């Protein structure tokens, strides 16, 4: 997808979620590379799961960037091809 | 252990201002942290960490005290749940000091990030902290600033905690929403807490708010169908905590609401009511008017409408009163509706000259209320202008006339069957 | 009384058992026999017609072929595949050193079961499946046994190669037999111990007669996908190399949380040496910090090997207490053998 | 509850919800509506809640049969279970 | 207050249906006369309160002949006399005359 088809999924899931008014979802949309629908669903869930151990209720902006690096990597440590020849 | 020697640790810093108290709190922060962490629920004494509050209270401004709570909030604080017991300590010196700190108390609440930002919600404290700030805004004359603060607090609802006290917090915004000038905001709040507390028994202090806020929203709406509904629910069921002397006149306004409303299903329920006939005469006077709905001739109604108005222009326990014109604005419109329903169910056709004398109106005012009831699907009447009559007989097809004739044939067989069995039943007296 | 009950028992005959299929008339129903034919059967006046509806397993007769007794729903009960035979052995005190990764299990198990209302107000959905990966010997198997000795709810042991039994479409029906208890008992968790099998790929080379296995792979793609009620049953899955498993199964929607179980570091192993040596008798003077540096790329289980070899070294010298010198000989004995690889797992994320 | 698929969901409603309402649109225009529908793409992206959203908006008969459940322990039961669907 | 209902009058004997005619043990008769006591002295508020349990008990537990109705319609005879409703007053005195 692109920054168009993806932002409709983030704004739709965030309706049922609880976030902060200062949280910006467009920051991670630019950094999205080769993602899908199931990956986006795991980002919003993990952001709310880590808020319990952090003594938080609504999802902040810092928790979105920390939980994003988990599901973005597509194989093991290598992403796809990583970078090298 | 070391927690019982805290009194003898620092001798001189008690009698002086003790500018080093900020350093003594940081030394005990790292030592007691490793001995607890997240393992033990309660290990270190909460008074040791909260001692910094009692050191500087009336001898220093509250600006420096808020800075200490900011560092403890960003750091661990010797425990993860220690913040729960620290804010409980904050609620002591607030009501015991006051004096010139009331103006600076506003800055103390806004400085704390726990009451502002959302947390794991172990507090059951900040809910009262938010209410204290709103009570200050209401005393300053700001209706909008008071309703907007509690609006965001009710978005996050705690899991259990307070039960009867949480109901008052939900109903608090409904009282301040009408003062803001919009009664539609409190409608959403009435669709949540009411359903959860419907099956749960309510105490005395619980039903005091429902006696007002439920009928206060519909008061500005001028819709009497919802006024006589929620009011009779609390009135009829239980309501034994109040005095029986003031409980009886409450019903006097209930019957008065049925006249201003488009009839209802609660009219026949109050006719058989035991307390409605006896006791206060105003209860029976309005009850006697209920049986006059079918017999209404309109003749004696404006005589009483212009003379006796016990529940009409004088309200005490329900509306409290507004104006003589406001209570009589919709009153005259309903009395016309009571007469038109009788004529439609009695007179098949009547001349306009006689219909105007029975309605005590002109030609323009007569057709105004009649034509409005036709569009509502209540009374269907064909007005004949050339004949100057109004035909109230609704047309029926050939199948409808033959259907009612079939019910009579089956009814005649019931009387033939009934009398047939009465010959044997009455044979005892005849054959005696 | 034992002899008189034998003669009274021989008077009774066998009674078939089948599930109610559909309803034709009030007293006339249809029940499928256990052998696979379907016969139209009758009922009696001694049973309630409300419980005779479709899906209810009833008792038939081998002669008259009529519904007789109503029985609760039980689909192939297996004591080895269902009952855990719980005997307390390992607890959270033996899995120590994983504390950083232990809170990951309690977050998806203890948190949603104790207070499910937290996930509802936040809006997040409770994690369904859980993935356990990493090299063997890190205590991954002990993570499932530590929960069974603590909570006590209904748990299910599911071996990978025990459900592969093949007659006709057998491997596909066994998976549906497990989820039958999920809707009955809500606080249930399905354990998976060392399963690389049912999560395979194998699309078409010619299939090598995988016909029942490919459907078994799809069974995990149905119960955790479709409209069946979920969220009350947690799926704990353990595997060695996730690259062998189907990448579609590892994606979100089935396994929500991937729990990393790496090799315990010097700080993690420090508490592990005292676990394996807790019940082992030794001298008064002991130092476990020596074996910390001696451990090169070991795991939590390999220290038990170090404690086991230390006992046999004292048998030849007639010593009931293991000396610290015999410990360092056994700790390096694992580092002398080697040939276990263990550094080839790149799936840490 | 699912955004960004409006481009894909528009073609689904034409091949599913449209022929179930007005069947004369395909006769007058003369286009044969597809009887079968296959959904491609990497597993875990589409499908899933899409079929549930279409079945809920249609409010009609819906039959969901798993692809691995057709096979039964009995031999000749396989072809009979397919016919009954 | 010395007798009331089922205190001194109930020991070894079952219910004779109160004080209807001649023999009996006072249960509903004393409670009916207390309402009649306050009927000719105090207001009618306390009198009707005691008549509510009498109407529900008469319609629940009764027999073939008419006995309790004599003492029941006796209090209602003077209860509706002071009221403004003469339609229900005739129906009460009609059954009491029977």
From Swiss-Prot, chain B:
Functional summary from the UniProt entry: Acts as a regulatory subunit of the 26S proteasome which is involved in the ATP-dependent degradation of ubiquitinated proteins.
InterPro entries to which the protein is assigned, alphabetical: PCI_dom, PSMD12-CSN4-like_N, PSMD12/CSN4, RPN5_C, WH-like_DNA-bd_sf, WH_DNA-bd_sf
Keywords, alphabetical: Acetylation, Proteasome
Record's protein name: 26S proteasome regulatory subunit RPN5
Listed SUPFAM superfamilies: Winged helix' DNA-binding domain
GO CC, one annotated term: proteasome complex
Coiled coil: none
TM region(s), chain numbering: none
Top-rank lineage group of the source organism: Eukaryota
UniProt record similarity statement: Belongs to the proteasome subunit p55 family.
Residues in PCI domain copies: 223-397
Description of post-translational modifications: N-acetylated by NAT1.
GO terms classed as biological process: proteasome-mediated ubiquitin-dependent protein catabolic process; protein deneddylation
A Pfam family annotated for this UniProt entry: RPN5_C
More info: Present with 5710 molecules/cell in log phase SD medium.
Organism the protein comes from: Saccharomyces cerevisiae (strain ATCC 204508 / S288c) (Baker's yeast)
From Swiss-Prot, chain C:
Record keyword Hydrolase present: no
Keywords, alphabetical: Acetylation, ATP-binding, Nucleotide-binding, Proteasome
Highest taxon listed in the record's lineage: Eukaryota
Binding site for ATP: 134-141
One Gene Ontology MF term: ubiquitin protein ligase binding
Cellular component, GO annotation: nucleus; proteasome complex; proteasome regulatory particle, base subcomplex
UniProt record similarity statement: Belongs to the AAA ATPase family.
Main function: The 26S proteasome is involved in the ATP-dependent degradation of ubiquitinated proteins. The regulatory (or ATPase) complex confers ATP dependency and substrate specificity to the 26S complex.
Name of the molecule in the record: 26S proteasome subunit RPT4
Organism of this sequence: Saccharomyces cerevisiae (strain ATCC 204508 / S288c) (Baker's yeast)
From Swiss-Prot, chain D:
Subcellular localization(s) per the UniProt record: Cytoplasm; Nucleus
Binding site for ATP: 41-48
Post-translational changes noted in the entry: N-acetylated by NAT3.
Similarity remark: Belongs to the AAA ATPase family.
Function: The 26S proteasome is involved in the ATP-dependent degradation of ubiquitinated proteins. The regulatory (or ATPase) complex confers ATP dependency and substrate specificity to the 26S complex.
Protein name: 26S proteasome regulatory subunit 6B homolog
Organism, scientific name: Saccharomyces cerevisiae (strain ATCC 204508 / S288c) (Baker's yeast)
First and last residues shown, out of full length: 173 to 257 of 428
Curated annotation (Swiss-Prot), chain E:
UniProt keywords, alphabetically: Proteasome
Protein's UniProt keywords contain Heme: no
Highest taxon of the lineage: Eukaryota
Example GO biological process: ubiquitin-dependent protein catabolic process
Example of a GO MF term: structural molecule activity
Main function: Acts as a regulatory subunit of the 26S proteasome which is involved in the ATP-dependent degradation of ubiquitinated proteins.
Protein name per its UniProtKB record: 26S proteasome regulatory subunit RPN9
Organism: Saccharomyces cerevisiae (strain ATCC 204508 / S288c) (Baker's yeast)
Full-protein positions shown: 100 to 197 of 393
